[PDB]
């Protein structure tokens, strides 16, 4: 996938290691990193303007 793009990388707080943590309760993670919950108990990190789940 080229640069200048978005990367998709597939408990109350879920942390990302290489960055941020996503709070599912109030659903809170500017715009560089985002956390999306495509399913139930499934999280994917999205990185705009181009990794471990903890």
């Amino acid at each position, epitope marked *: 996938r*080229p640069t*200048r*793009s*978005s990367a*998709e990388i597939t408990a109350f707080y879920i942390h990302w290691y290489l960055l941020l943590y996503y709070d599912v309760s*109030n*659903s*809170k*993670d*500017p*715009g560089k990193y*985002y956390t*999306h*919950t*495509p399913r*139930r108990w499934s999280w994917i990190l*999205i990185l*705009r*303007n181009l990794y471990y789940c903890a």
Partner: T-cell receptor
Amino acid sequence: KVTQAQSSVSMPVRKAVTLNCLYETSWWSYYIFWYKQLPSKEMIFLIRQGSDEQNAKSGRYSVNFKKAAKSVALTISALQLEDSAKYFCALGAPHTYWGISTDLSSWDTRQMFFGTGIKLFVEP
Amino acid sequence: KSVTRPTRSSAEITCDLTVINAFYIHWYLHQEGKAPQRLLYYDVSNSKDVLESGLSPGKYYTHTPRRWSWILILRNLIENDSGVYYCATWDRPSKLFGSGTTLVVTD
């Protein structure tokens, strides 16, 4: 702002129905778009009528644009059965570079302001 | 064309806008009784989200799954968030609209 006061108008097939849409604007030059939202919710573009253009026509579709009255009402002539939809009068300023606020937006970031729509029933 | 998601969840809106040279992708919400209204537009080149005034960040996100592809993501869904969502991009004679997906938010 767009004001479509009348909704759910009914007209027979083969007649002509005029959908009255108004607008409120502070733009020197602008365009008014007539879309139809199908039952599949597929918003289909029908006609484009500029503020500084002659009353637009697209075959069956026509516009009776009144710049001073801000009446850009659409008219559909010789309706067929597959004409019933929710007709939206939308005020936008896409291809306009002068006459809007001092924002640095490049008109590709400009929103198409919609009226609440008018459903048209094509009775037989 | 339909996306059913519970409250306090995340919903995705993908659409068939095949525009290649698009620079901005607007996301309109038609709530079936009001006018179709923009929630945001996505600056494709700089990849930014411009929300309408009075909103809060993180309510809406625009994802780029592929090259010329966009998805509107809603966090902490509420019932008011239900409606129809369109991806709209300005075209030369008009504003092209996606097929539009209905997001219904269940209890």
